[PDB]
Amino acid sequence: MSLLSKTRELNTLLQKHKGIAVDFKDVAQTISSVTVTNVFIVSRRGKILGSSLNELLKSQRIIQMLEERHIPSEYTERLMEVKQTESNIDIDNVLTVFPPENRELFIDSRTTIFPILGGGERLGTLVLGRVHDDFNENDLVLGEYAATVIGMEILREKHSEVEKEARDKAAITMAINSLSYSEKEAIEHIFEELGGTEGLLIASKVADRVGITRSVIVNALRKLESAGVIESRSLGMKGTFIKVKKEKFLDELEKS
Amino acid sequence: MSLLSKTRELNTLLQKHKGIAVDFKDVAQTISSVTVTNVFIVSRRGKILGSSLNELLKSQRIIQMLEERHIPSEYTERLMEVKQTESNIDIDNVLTVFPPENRELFIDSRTTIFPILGGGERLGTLVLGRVHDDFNENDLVLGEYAATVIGMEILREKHSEVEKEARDKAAITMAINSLSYSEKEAIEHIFEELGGTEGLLIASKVADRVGITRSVIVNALRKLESAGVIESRSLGMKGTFIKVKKEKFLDELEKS
Amino acid sequence: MSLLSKTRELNTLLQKHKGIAVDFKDVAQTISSVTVTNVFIVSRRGKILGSSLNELLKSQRIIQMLEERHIPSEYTERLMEVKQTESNIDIDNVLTVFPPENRELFIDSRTTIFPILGGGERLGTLVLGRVHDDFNENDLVLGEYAATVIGMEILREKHSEVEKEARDKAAITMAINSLSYSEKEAIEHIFEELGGTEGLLIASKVADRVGITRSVIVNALRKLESAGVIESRSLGMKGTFIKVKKEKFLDELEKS
Amino acid sequence: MSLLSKTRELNTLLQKHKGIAVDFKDVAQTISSVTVTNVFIVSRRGKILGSSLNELLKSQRIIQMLEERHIPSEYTERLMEVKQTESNIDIDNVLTVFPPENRELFIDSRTTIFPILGGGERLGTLVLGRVHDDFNENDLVLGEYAATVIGMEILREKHSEVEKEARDKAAITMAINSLSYSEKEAIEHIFEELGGTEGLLIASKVADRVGITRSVIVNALRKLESAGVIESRSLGMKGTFIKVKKEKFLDELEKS
DNA sequence: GATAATTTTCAGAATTTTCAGAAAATTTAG
DNA sequence: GATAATTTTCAGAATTTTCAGAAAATTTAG
Ligand SMILES: Nc1nc2c(ncn2[C@@H]2O[C@H](COP(=O)(O)OP(=O)(O)OP(=O)(O)O)[C@@H](O)[C@H]2O)c(=O)[nH]1
Ligand SMILES: Nc1nc2c(ncn2[C@@H]2O[C@H](COP(=O)(O)OP(=O)(O)OP(=O)(O)O)[C@@H](O)[C@H]2O)c(=O)[nH]1
Ligand SMILES: Nc1nc2c(ncn2[C@@H]2O[C@H](COP(=O)(O)OP(=O)(O)OP(=O)(O)O)[C@@H](O)[C@H]2O)c(=O)[nH]1
Ligand SMILES: Nc1nc2c(ncn2[C@@H]2O[C@H](COP(=O)(O)OP(=O)(O)OP(=O)(O)O)[C@@H](O)[C@H]2O)c(=O)[nH]1
Ligand SMILES: CC[C@H](C)[C@H](N)C(=O)O
Ligand SMILES: CC[C@H](C)[C@H](N)C(=O)O
Ligand SMILES: CC[C@H](C)[C@H](N)C(=O)O
Ligand SMILES: CC[C@H](C)[C@H](N)C(=O)O
């Protein structure tokens, strides 16, 4: 099986995965097939995001490591020292992925470490190990496709979660500014009587006890409703039902 | 220059690009440098998302294509019928990326087509062109790997686009439900006289033409600001400035 | 000389330094006196912030390192691996501060590495080396006073520069919001004709060419003057003299 | 517990505190834990910046001191006369930190005084108290090193305080120069009727009492907002809300 | 000393704005 | 079907606000 067929095999997993997310465990399996290696996709903090082992599964430490979803904290930082792709690493090296204890079974073992880069920084590490054979250039080509692609699926993940928080801050800010002076004070006193995420209270009485017009309170709520900060429904004599959908709202209110 | 050298060059563009969006015009010329080819990155409908050419620029048609940001209609169809990679296409084949009229300069021209796939569907096509040298398998490895990542960035963009159009619909609806009856009527008329995405008008004047209280207009606008549907700016004696941040708002409002 | 007298010596340098800043070179000298060692105060990126060497000055690499204001980039990252105070490190170790080349002169050499911590993260490293003798606990007490104190003078420096940028953003924002719609457009057209940091222009003519009232322009400038964004003086027939004192102002204006 | 163990404990509080400001109440009890002492951190004028006591809390006077956040006037003087560290002070010496009346519980009490020095001047005093055990030299090493860092955090705070009062003066002056003659007159009267740091008043009413155009008042307030001297809030029919962010503004204005 | 050129100041109207409160509309329980 | 309890809607006045522009004030050159 030629390199083209191996690259074609890997590139097919990505071109046909439904959705946008790519399962790194699926990737780990594919990387093992076309190269016959034990695969480890670890984070910058060592969290195991993918794995496709066989010979290593035969070690006690490795089993307890897969359950921890982590790797030796000390060995995690040593992978950070590899800034370029270092291949063909024997068992007599510190960067070997195989247990130095069971050296007899892994005497001819060779280890290669690919760094995962994205957006201009370090994102993870892709460690591949073999029991005897060595790594050639055709293997480093396949491994660098993975690191470059994994870093892209991580760069998207980190970026998408930043966009989410950035929108919530805008939604809260977009709402806090649309409030009037009397409407900010109204919202402060309501969330006080409400106490929790959702509840039921009589807005009118809260308006009378505090000395704020009743329509000023209805006005503030409808603005927060428009901004997606809360959901509200009327219950007539029972009162007004409120369900906060953005918790950080109040915290940013007094801050204003 | 070995394949592992060309591969490392391409991956470097992707791992260090700032932000998240990868510019296809950068990819195209990067693909062109490492393979010594004329590069086209086109969509299903033949829009040139990115290109980096040299010899082809000595043809009249190629220039007007770049001006139109599109490729011929006839050619776009025949690219869709290419369901797999097809390399070393001669000048006399319809799938050739070189103008046949300039045969004196393109008689020994070879052109390979790489379908761009993402999420299991055809997103576009990556076309490479050479004047003399044929395409080896080490070239198909790059072109196929570049079409893969190109499909990944398109898959991602189309997803973020859909998420945004959905967040917008939600913003409009959430803001329309916040409007009372008289408030919902003012906005219909305010946005009628505005005539465009943004403008300046005298609200109190429009309030008297229809017979709605001016206070109604002020509160309604302030509720659309809470949902990020419009930006509003008071110019006192000169009127009110209104910039709409959601095209489809007015259309959606009329539905109700 | 007892430890109390050594601690008293060090604590005097800090209690009597005039001003708020503490010169790390002065510190380097004091740390060398009370312990008789070659002192290195390096950053997280290896930048030498202080030094008090003697025996090492006798090496060619060290001389070229002091001029670079840096240390071997590779050795800089290895110091990051020391998370706790590691002392009594022989020349046969990678973390030795002495040149492994001139091993014969530094055979009994012992090296100690103190990490500089502040605010909850790593800030630098304090490396001490000896030619023969070893380190005791009384030496680690003195070295940890230094690391803890150096980290405090660095935490203050980093914090003070953050407070400075945070105020400039507020000054610009505090000003951009106080501007009216017509006053923002006025400031946009003035900085256009101005071209550079400071210059001379006739505001009236700029007002007439663009179609904005002349007093609207005087009003915008006086607000920016109040916010410290610009300095302005009148020159009657010659025009108005403007000197921008905050460059990022305009960049944040169109962004609004 | 060795000195190097006690030292490492204190440094840990300083290296991991969040922000920049170190809370002296944390330092005091930390000093108390590692040396088994009653701790007082007082200024020149005897204000208890921080304390952590146990046995002393069984005395009436000590409690009222904590309530007053001050120490006796007579005792504060005698601490200033202590120009150097003085350890193992008996119960019958005026420099004792223990109430003589409770002699039955404090007859074998020992108390050491550590002057707190920063920038070459006396900033405060660190006082430690014990019921039985005397103070060794390993204790003077901690108390002297704690007084040093305490002096460092006071030196820093007093500097940031002065920089702020200077930035304020600049903000006031810069804002006053931005005011015209009629504008400068309105603010004098507006701030006269306000009577306090913040309040609500009817500007247009105050405009007619004096005979100034209402527009003048609006623009003047908007110029003080640009310099961060006040916050202003429009309440329409109810009036204008004004919060002053710079106490000394009104005073400084009257000077002109 | 005075003209000429901008630059500021000041005054005033039109519009925008926030709040009050009475009438309308709703929900819940009967 | 109807009372009672809040909840919304709507209308209206008082105040705040932004802009225009004419008169005043300033600087520069003579
Ligand atoms: N698409 C995709 N992304 C993944 C997968 N596994 C992990 N990630 C992403 O990888 C990113 C980093 O991994 P973390 O969950 O943060 O693990 P960690 O222990 O916190 O390590 P650090 O990210 O370095 O802090 C996360 O934001 C995930 O979105 C996966 O299987 N598929
Ligand atoms: N990252 C990135 N995406 C791009 C670039 N140019 C185009 N795209 C994406 O390519 C996709 C198609 O480009 P369009 O310009 O919309 O072309 P089209 O005619 O709509 O193409 P069809 O998808 O066939 O309908 C969209 O998802 C774009 O976001 C580029 O330079 N960078
Ligand atoms: N008080 C004081 N601070 C210093 C001294 N030398 C350096 N610093 C501070 O140490 C901080 C970090 O050093 P840098 O100038 O940033 O050196 P660098 O090469 O950029 O290394 P990094 O800070 O890790 O990025 C700076 O912000 C300085 O303010 C000194 O002699 N006295
Ligand atoms: N970091 C820090 N500084 C503090 C703390 N308590 C007081 N200070 C500083 O200690 C100094 C004096 O405290 P004050 O409360 O002003 O006492 P004082 O009576 O003015 O003292 P004198 O300086 O003698 O006039 C000031 O610079 C304060 O900022 C604290 O808990 N943490
Ligand atoms: C997978 C980690 C490997 C075994 C590494 N050599 C260690 O001992 O931690
Ligand atoms: C890019 C278009 C190519 C050259 C096509 N064969 C044509 O003749 O138009
Ligand atoms: C000061 C650096 C020392 C000599 C280190 N062992 C190196 O060789 O880089
Ligand atoms: C803290 C004050 C001490 C106890 C002082 N000697 C007194 O008697 O008041």
Author numbering:
A (entry chain B), B (entry chain A), C (entry chain B), D (entry chain A): 1 to 256
Can you quote the paper on this entry?
The crystal structure of the SaCodY–DNA complex—also presented below—had Ile/GTP-bound GAF domains. The SaCodY-DNA complex was co-crystallized with Ile and GTP. The Ile/GTP-bound GAF domains of SaCodY in its free and DNA-bound forms are essentially identical, demonstrating that the GAF domains do not undergo a structural change upon DBD domain-DNA interaction. In the crystals, two CodY dimers bind to a single DNA duplex. The dimers are related by a 60° rotation and a 30-Å translation along the DNA, binding one side of the DNA helix. The spatial relationship of the two dimers of SaCodY is defined by a crystallographic axis. DNA interactions are primarily mediated by hydrogen bonds of residues with the sugar–phosphate backbone of the DNA, indicative of an indirect or shape readout mechanism. What follows is a detailed description of the interactions between protomer B of SaCodY and the 5′ half-site DNA. The position of the recognition helix in the major groove is stabilized by hydrogen bonds of recognition helix residues Thr213 and Arg222 to backbone phosphates of T5, T6 and T17’ located on opposite sides of the major groove (the prime-sign indicates template strand nt). Ser215, located at the recognition helix N-terminus, forms the only base-specific hydrogen bond between the recognition helix and major groove bases.
In Gram-positive pathogens such as Staphylococcus aureus (Sa) and Enterococcus faecalis (Ef), the pleiotropic transcription factor CodY plays a key role in integrating metabolism and virulence factor expression. CodY DNA-binding is activated by two types of ligands: branched chain amino acids (BCAAs, i.e. isoleucine, leucine, and valine) and, in most cases, guanosine triphosphate, GTP. Each 30 kDa protomer comprises the N-terminal ligand-binding domain called GAF (cGMP-specific phosphodiesterases, adenylyl cyclases and FhlA). The GAF domain is connected by an extended linker helix to the C-terminal DNA-binding (DBD) domain that contains a winged helix-turn-helix (wHTH) motif.
